[PDB]
Amino acid sequence: AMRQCAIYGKGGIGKSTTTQNLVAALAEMGKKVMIVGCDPKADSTRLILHSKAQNTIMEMAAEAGTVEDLELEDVLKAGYGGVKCVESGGPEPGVGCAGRGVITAINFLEEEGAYEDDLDFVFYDVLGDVVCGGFAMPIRENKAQEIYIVCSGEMMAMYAANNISKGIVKYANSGSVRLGGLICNSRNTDREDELIIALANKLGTQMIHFVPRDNVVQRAEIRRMTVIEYDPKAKQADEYRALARKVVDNKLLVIPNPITMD
Amino acid sequence: AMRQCAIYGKGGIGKSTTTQNLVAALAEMGKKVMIVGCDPKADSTRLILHSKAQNTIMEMAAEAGTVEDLELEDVLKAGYGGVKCVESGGPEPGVGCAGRGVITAINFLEEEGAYEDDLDFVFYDVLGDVVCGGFAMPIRENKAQEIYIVCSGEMMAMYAANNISKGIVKYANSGSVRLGGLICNSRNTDREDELIIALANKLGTQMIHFVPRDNVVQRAEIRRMTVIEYDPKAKQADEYRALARKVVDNKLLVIPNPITMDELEELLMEFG
Amino acid sequence: SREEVESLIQEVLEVYPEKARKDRNKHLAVNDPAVTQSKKCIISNKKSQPGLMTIRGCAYAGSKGVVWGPIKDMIHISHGPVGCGQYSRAGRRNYYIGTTGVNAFVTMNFTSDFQEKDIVFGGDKKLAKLIDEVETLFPLNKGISVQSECPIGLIGDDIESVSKVKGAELSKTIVPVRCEGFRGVSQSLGHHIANDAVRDWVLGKRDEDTTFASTPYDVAIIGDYNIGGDAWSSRILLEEMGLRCVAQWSGDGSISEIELTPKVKLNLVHCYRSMNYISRHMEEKYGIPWMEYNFFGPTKTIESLRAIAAKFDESIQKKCEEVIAKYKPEWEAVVAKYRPRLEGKRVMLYIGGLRPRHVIGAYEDLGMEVVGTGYEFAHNDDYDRTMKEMGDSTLLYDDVTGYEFEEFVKRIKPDLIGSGIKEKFIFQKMGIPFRQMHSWDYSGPYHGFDGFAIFARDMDMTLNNPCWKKLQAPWE
Amino acid sequence: SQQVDKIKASYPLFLDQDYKDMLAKKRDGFEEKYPQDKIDEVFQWTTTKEYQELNFQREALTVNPAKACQPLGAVLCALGFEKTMPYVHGSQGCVAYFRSYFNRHFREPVSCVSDSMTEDAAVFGGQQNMKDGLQNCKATYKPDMIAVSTTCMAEVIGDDLNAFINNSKKEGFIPDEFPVPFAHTPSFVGSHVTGWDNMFEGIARYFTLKSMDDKVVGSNKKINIVPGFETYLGNFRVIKRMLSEMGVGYSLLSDPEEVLDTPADGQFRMYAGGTTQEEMKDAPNALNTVLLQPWHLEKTKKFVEGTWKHEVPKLNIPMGLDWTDEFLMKVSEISGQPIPASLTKERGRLVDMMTDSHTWLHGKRFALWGDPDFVMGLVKFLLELGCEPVHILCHNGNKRWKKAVDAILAASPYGKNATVYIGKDLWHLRSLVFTDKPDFMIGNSYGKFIQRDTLHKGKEFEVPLIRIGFPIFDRHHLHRSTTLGYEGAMQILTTLVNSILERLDEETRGMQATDYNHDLVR
Numbered sequence A: 001a002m003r004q005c006a007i008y009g010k011g012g013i014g015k016s017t018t019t020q021n022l023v024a025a026l027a028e029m030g031k032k033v034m035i036v037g038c039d040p041k042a043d044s045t046r047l048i049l050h051s052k053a054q055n056t057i058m059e060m061a062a063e064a065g066t067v068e069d070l071e072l073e074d075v076l077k078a079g080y081g082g083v084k085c086v087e088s089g090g091p092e093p094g095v096g097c098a099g100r101g102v103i104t105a106i107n108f109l110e111e112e113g114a115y116e117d118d119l120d121f122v123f124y125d126v127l128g129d130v131v132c133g134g135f136a137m138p139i140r141e142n143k144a145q146e147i148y149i150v151c152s153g154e155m156m157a158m159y160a161a162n163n164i165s166k167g168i169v170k171y172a173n174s175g176s177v178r179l180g181g182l183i184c185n186s187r188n189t190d191r192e193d194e195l196i197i198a199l200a201n202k203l204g205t206q207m208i209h210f211v212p213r214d215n216v217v218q219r220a221e222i223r224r225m226t227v228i229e230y231d232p233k234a235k236q237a238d239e240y241r242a243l244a245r246k247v248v249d250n251k252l253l254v255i256p257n258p259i260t261m262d
Numbered sequence B: 001a002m003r004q005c006a007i008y009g010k011g012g013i014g015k016s017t018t019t020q021n022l023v024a025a026l027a028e029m030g031k032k033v034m035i036v037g038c039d040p041k042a043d044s045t046r047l048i049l050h051s052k053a054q055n056t057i058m059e060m061a062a063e064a065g066t067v068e069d070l071e072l073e074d075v076l077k078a079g080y081g082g083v084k085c086v087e088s089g090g091p092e093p094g095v096g097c098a099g100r101g102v103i104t105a106i107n108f109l110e111e112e113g114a115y116e117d118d119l120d121f122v123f124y125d126v127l128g129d130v131v132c133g134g135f136a137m138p139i140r141e142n143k144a145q146e147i148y149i150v151c152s153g154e155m156m157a158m159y160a161a162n163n164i165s166k167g168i169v170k171y172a173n174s175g176s177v178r179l180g181g182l183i184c185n186s187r188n189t190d191r192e193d194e195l196i197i198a199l200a201n202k203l204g205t206q207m208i209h210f211v212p213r214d215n216v217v218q219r220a221e222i223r224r225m226t227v228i229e230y231d232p233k234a235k236q237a238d239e240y241r242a243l244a245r246k247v248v249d250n251k252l253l254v255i256p257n258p259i260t261m262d263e264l265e266e267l268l269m270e271f272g
Numbered sequence C: 001s002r003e004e005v006e007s008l009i010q011e012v013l014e015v016y017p018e019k020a021r022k023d024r025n026k027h028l029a030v031n032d033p034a035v036t037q038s039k040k041c042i043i044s045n046k047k048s049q050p051g052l053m054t055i056r057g058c059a060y061a062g063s064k065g066v067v068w069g070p071i072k073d074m075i076h077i078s079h080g081p082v083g084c085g086q087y088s089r090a091g092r093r094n095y096y097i098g099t100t101g102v103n104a105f106v107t108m109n110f111t112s113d114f115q116e117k118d119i120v121f122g123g124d125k126k127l128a129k130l131i132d133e134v135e136t137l138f139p140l141n142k143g144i145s146v147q148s149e150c151p152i153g154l155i156g157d158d159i160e161s162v163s164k165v166k167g168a169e170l171s172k173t174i175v176p177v178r179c180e181g182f183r184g185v186s187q188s189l190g191h192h193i194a195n196d197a198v199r200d201w202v203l204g205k206r207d208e209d210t211t212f213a214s215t216p217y218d219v220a221i222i223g224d225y226n227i228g229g230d231a232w233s234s235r236i237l238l239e240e241m242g243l244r245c246v247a248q249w250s251g252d253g254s255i256s257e258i259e260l261t262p263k264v265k266l267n268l269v270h271c272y273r274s275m276n277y278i279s280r281h282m283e284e285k286y287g288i289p290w291m292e293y294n295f296f297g298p299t300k301t302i303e304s305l306r307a308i309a310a311k312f313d314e315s316i317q318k319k320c321e322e323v324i325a326k327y328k329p330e331w332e333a334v335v336a337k338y339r340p341r342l343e344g345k346r347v348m349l350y351i352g353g354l355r356p357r358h359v360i361g362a363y364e365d366l367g368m369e370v371v372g373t374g375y376e377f378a379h380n381d382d383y384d385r386t387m388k389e390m391g392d393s394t395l396l397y398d399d400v401t402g403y404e405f406e407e408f409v410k411r412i413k414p415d416l417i418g419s420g421i422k423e424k425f426i427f428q429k430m431g432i433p434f435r436q437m438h439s440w441d442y443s444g445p446y447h448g449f450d451g452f453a454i455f456a457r458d459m460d461m462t463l464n465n466p467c468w469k470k471l472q473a474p475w476e
Numbered sequence D: 001s002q003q004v005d006k007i008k009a010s011y012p013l014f015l016d017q018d019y020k021d022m023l024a025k026k027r028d029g030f031e032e033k034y035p036q037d038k039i040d041e042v043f044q045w046t047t048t049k050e051y052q053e054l055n056f057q058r059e060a061l062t063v064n065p066a067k068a069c070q071p072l073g074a075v076l077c078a079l080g081f082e083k084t085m086p087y088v089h090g091s092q093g094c095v096a097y098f099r100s101y102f103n104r105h106f107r108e109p110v111s112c113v114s115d116s117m118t119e120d121a122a123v124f125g126g127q128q129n130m131k132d133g134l135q136n137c138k139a140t141y142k143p144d145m146i147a148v149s150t151t152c153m154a155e156v157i158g159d160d161l162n163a164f165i166n167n168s169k170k171e172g173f174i175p176d177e178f179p180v181p182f183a184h185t186p187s188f189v190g191s192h193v194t195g196w197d198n199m200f201e202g203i204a205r206y207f208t209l210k211s212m213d214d215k216v217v218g219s220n221k222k223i224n225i226v227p228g229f230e231t232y233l234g235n236f237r238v239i240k241r242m243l244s245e246m247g248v249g250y251s252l253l254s255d256p257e258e259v260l261d262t263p264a265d266g267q268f269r270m271y272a273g274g275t276t277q278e279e280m281k282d283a284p285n286a287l288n289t290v291l292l293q294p295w296h297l298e299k300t301k302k303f304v305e306g307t308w309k310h311e312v313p314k315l316n317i318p319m320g321l322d323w324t325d326e327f328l329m330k331v332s333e334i335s336g337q338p339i340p341a342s343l344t345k346e347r348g349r350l351v352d353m354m355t356d357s358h359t360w361l362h363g364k365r366f367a368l369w370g371d372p373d374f375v376m377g378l379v380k381f382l383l384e385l386g387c388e389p390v391h392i393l394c395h396n397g398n399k400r401w402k403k404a405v406d407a408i409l410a411a412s413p414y415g416k417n418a419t420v421y422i423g424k425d426l427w428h429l430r431s432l433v434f435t436d437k438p439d440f441m442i443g444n445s446y447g448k449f450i451q452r453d454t455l456h457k458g459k460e461f462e463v464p465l466i467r468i469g470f471p472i473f474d475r476h477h478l479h480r481s482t483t484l485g486y487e488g489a490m491q492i493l494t495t496l497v498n499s500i501l502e503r504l505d506e507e508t509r510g511m512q513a514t515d516y517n518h519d520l521v522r
């Protein structure tokens, strides 16, 4: 009934963009989707909600005194297509502990029953460098069961996909959490789709889709919108629908096999 | 005086590369330099040492039992130009606490007298996202006094340059830490240099130097060395020398004024 | 016996998985008083094996509970969640004279009481605000320490900064202490972090000042925390001997005594483990010599009085021989009354870092034998001092496990055990007489001539109590 | 000096002239102590209304709190199950503290392990410590079950207990069927009562979550009893006695009464009695589940209503007459058993005691503190007696609980002068008993410091401490008492009316001044 997915990938690769554009298409297909942002900058739902969604979970808890005093009504809002949005929140750079903020928010959503409306998909958008246990909260047991790793043809992006896959293994062995595939967000490198297919093969997974580099994405972002909402007829808009259709039909869920760099 | 700088910037913008190349050129000028990696992966010193940086402080400490058992000699190595290299280390993704790894490591260097040399420069190469107090350890009192933010003409880098400044303000006030400038690592966006100069102005800083995107950097990277060493005659090798003298001769130190997400967008719109 | 004890060691160790076995084997030894390099016979100050019920505490207990907490006219903030500060509130009996809540604060629990928002957003703002409320509500406090608990060290709060800033704004010494509980392997590293902080933030305040009037008889008592008044009972002997005690660290201690310690001629170090750090530093920086002494029982005390008095002129030596002559009839009568009741009795000890060797003297003065002893957290230099004090083929244990200690006692069958509150009730149920050797079972002092009397009476009351013959029901 | 025939300990030894003289010299010479004049003026100031206003403006500083952190409760919970070892994943300092804390209250051994996470386990995670630790514990102390909780540091770094344990099993450190229930117990959330709730829920979920398919509610004909964080041995015993007395089949889930009261017979027993694993597995088959202390069993209640499908009754803690009555009728309603003549007579003997003592209890004013259910039970009983609670403090309380207690207070003429405080500590309470003096305090040992303070102002301002609660470290064997049911109510009534009479005799013991009212008959 309910599918929970977590999006990982190298810092700066396009996770929050790709995630939100997918969900837009998914909602446009008639799915009930929740997006859970797990980044202290709280930008993960910024394109589904135009302009603002002022209220992060940690913010409201800090103001309200404690997380226990906070009601579900305060932090969960709906945007384009009825997509439900909630943000973990956390501190500004260089102080406090953003990891614990994620643990607390995910624990809040569970305790308040946020997962049991009539939801088809839950998406956790996680930040790039996964520096601590807090940021693997979305891939614990009874959280996300599918992980998709955003990468590209350059050396650094792939290196990251592999290190995230190692971090997954301890959660995959002891649980049901599985890698769903690699999503290639193009950087226009040579023979790039073939290259990511090869990497996917060595891991034990597939490349679900090749997403072209198209500046409509950034132009829509500047408007606080998804490409789906900003320009439904564009070529990139059909790309996210294709990616969307494939995620619905994916059956491939593996424990990945990390490689040695040679 | 010894000058301490901390290098910040968006994930993937090219910090480690720019930092090591900047430092090689500094050593090439006859400066005595130390590099401190504050990233759980050990790649901050890999182009100076000619192989991966196998012995991070945390790894050596865990092996020896506790950091109290650890020797400075076991973690401090010298590479190209006599540059001193040390790595914090930390976990692989998703377990433990990389923040504490940095806090532990910096404290170790201080206790073992790592700064009590005649060093001319110390550079801290820091993680993309500054998610907690540990990753701001490099900018407390008696640590970095100069911050450089590596960015690009791309949206993500400038948003990040602005967000990091928010974090800087808190430490600038209780300490001597100052924003020194922006290093623009090109992504070939249109009118890229004008945009970073403009962004620099609204914050109160300069754009220190424009580093072009040059595939020679990646060729040297595959050879596990800096461009300064890989190709001393190259045009890019000259770009790093330029950046080096500008940081060396830099006197502009400000507390930045972060702008609003609106101003940042109207800026992108004004140039693109 | 030497071989029998070695056999006992190998049998006990048979229960452990191999990793824990190879390690616990390094921390149990059969003593040789001839050996002077303990590294050869035993190793200590390593991390505890997980899941084996060590009796060890953390760095914070070592720093706040032990070194800092006794200083009576400072306010010590337990910085972090509410537990640590609450389990240590008035648990250790470091006696002091004062008006609690007004000019003295030892039995009080000050904390920042972290909630979840303080973890995630960090607590420097709360800490700053906390220091303002303190200075409002306790205006006679003469300084503040900030004792970090586990999460302060993880998240990277900048308590040094808050201490320099708030301290300047208020002209108040504020000492930030990173005694995070996960640091080190035990209480021991907490001592060290506590001594370095004294050094860095307090000990130098009067380096330029020369107003204090100094005599050639000035000494400081270093490393006595005045348990049940131990230090007050020691201090009286030193002064009857004509010495003047400017400082006591840190039992009944004031922040001004600490600042005046650099003006003394000699440092008298009772607890070597917890304060040898600052003592070496004061010798290096101010030229002050230091020496270890033992005031447990008459023999050690008499020997210590003579050794200390020898560091001064003949007048102090004359007064030494006077003090001795005065208390001689008092400790001899104690012996005549209580030793016949204790002669030949065997005791096993397990304590922290000083007493497992230090009190052996007092037991022998009552005709008792120490058959086993060990420490929670000594270093090899403590075991260097230990082995000549123990008899041959006695058992030595380090960071002993609940299981190991349980089984050693089953075989060795001592008449008395002297250990801590966690040990107490296990061995009473076994029918074995037990004395607390941290808290002195809410009795004491045991230091000096006056303490020895309470010491003799406590060892006899307990060991010879009528309750110990009642453990078996007549019918089974 | 010591006279060998009469040795003096620290008191009164340090009252000898030579020690006193020596301490005078310490103070004058080196202490740089504020003049007595100033100390007395500062002291007096802290007893005023103006100091109280400042004191109640605090936002960041806590002084003398009246609570401890979550894992303390977890440990107590875990102790209540057969051959179970409490295991705290995180720093070992915590465990040393938890054991000492319970040792002192119970005057018993307290068994619990750590997995000794040091600095490298802080930055790398505690996966290894959890592997080696579970293996070492099982091998050495041989429990049937290991119940895992966390220190604050394991919580900051997000150590995934479920995964760490599953990998331990998968890799052969412990056998797969070896029961290892867990609960995240962060110290910077709630308090020690919250830790009990969290631990119980982990264990109950562990034994009943998979296998709800073959469960039928009511099929074992018994009533589940969940006591909560409880530290009076008599409290476990009295619930068990009243149910047996009614003929009710019952199952006490978490029962530490035996293991915390083992006999001194020549052997040490690390384990004794407690709730069996089979009892937990069978629990969903019970008629219903009664929570003794609902205000800290909210997480347990959701799992039991949601997973087991029990209509958990809305019952207050069974303290005092109304709520013991209410408990007994509802147990009667669920099980089919009428209330036996023996309990009915006991009820009337507590009523008889209330009638006998009412003239001395009437209008007496109390300040009190403790855990949420304890406090509200104690408040309800004080009102039934004709007493006036004045200061009601519950440091680990919440806004909803405070609302309920304010309603009970307002329903009675005797609550008109009472105010409830949540989030406030013993330094706050100290101000209250100086500015609005009650006759007595009812709280734990920490209250002796208040009593010392009130006395220093003057013998007419002294507010005596009545020791009921947790922890009690300065009296012996009060942990064997009872506070629940009729039996608890008789004990409390007797403790109260006799504190009142003990104090009155002290105030009337002055020869030819106050002793005209030193009556033989009261």
Ligand SMILES: Nc1ncnc2c1ncn2[C@@H]1O[C@H](COP(=O)(O)OP(=O)(O)CP(=O)(O)O)[C@@H](O)[C@H]1O
Binding pocket: A009, A010, A011, A012, A013, A014, A015, A016, A017, A018, A039, A126, A127, A128, A129, A185, A186, A211, A212, A213, A214, A215, A217, A218, A221, B011, B154, B155, B156
């Ligand atoms: N297919 C595409 N074509 C062109 N630009 C794209 C793109 N996908 C993403 N981008 C741009 O790249 C930038 C990064 O996108 P996004 O913010 O989603 O990355 P991310 O979430 O991986 C960074 P972090 O790890 O810090 O959360 C944005 O400016 C976005 O508009």
Ligand SMILES: Nc1ncnc2c1ncn2[C@@H]1O[C@H](COP(=O)(O)OP(=O)(O)CP(=O)(O)O)[C@@H](O)[C@H]1O
Binding pocket: A011, A155, A156, B009, B010, B011, B012, B013, B014, B015, B016, B017, B018, B039, B127, B128, B185, B186, B211, B212, B213, B214, B215, B216, B217, B218, B221
């Ligand atoms: N000026 C330039 N021209 C060409 N390639 C460059 C370059 N600067 C960096 N690169 C390449 O881009 C890749 C990323 O470099 P680098 O590792 O320094 O980025 P970074 O440190 O911000 C990533 P992280 O966030 O993981 O630390 C490297 O392959 C590097 O060789």
Ligand code: ICS
Binding pocket: C062, C066, C092, C187, C225, C227, C271, C272, C273, C274, C351, C352, C353, C354, C355, C356, C437, C438, C439
């Ligand atoms: S300080 Fe140490 S454990 Fe030297 S931490 Fe401990 S009041 Fe012990 S053996 Mo408790 S090194 Fe003091 C000690 Fe000895 S608390 Fe007391 S009794 S002489």
Ligand code: CLF
Binding pocket: C058, C059, C060, C061, C081, C082, C083, C084, C085, C148, C149, C150, C179, C180, C181, C182, D069, D070, D071, D091, D092, D093, D094, D095, D097, D150, D151, D152, D153, D187
């Ligand atoms: S080693 Fe503290 S008791 Fe713990 S769960 Fe945190 S609040 Fe409770 Fe030492 S410093 Fe303290 S006592 Fe431990 S936590 Fe660390």
Ligand code: SF4
Binding pocket: A096, A097, A098, A099, A100, A131, A132, A133, A134, B096, B097, B098, B099, B100, B131, B132, B133, B134, C154, C155, C156, D156, D157, D158
């Ligand atoms: S690394 Fe993760 S856990 Fe450790 S402090 Fe930073 S955010 Fe909190």
Ligand SMILES: [Fe+2]
Binding pocket: C425, D106, D107, D108
């Ligand atoms: Fe007992």
Ligand SMILES: [Mg+2]
Binding pocket: A015, A016, A039, A125, A126, A127, A128
């Ligand atoms: Mg993102």
Ligand SMILES: [Mg+2]
Binding pocket: B015, B016, B039, B125, B126
């Ligand atoms: Mg880098």
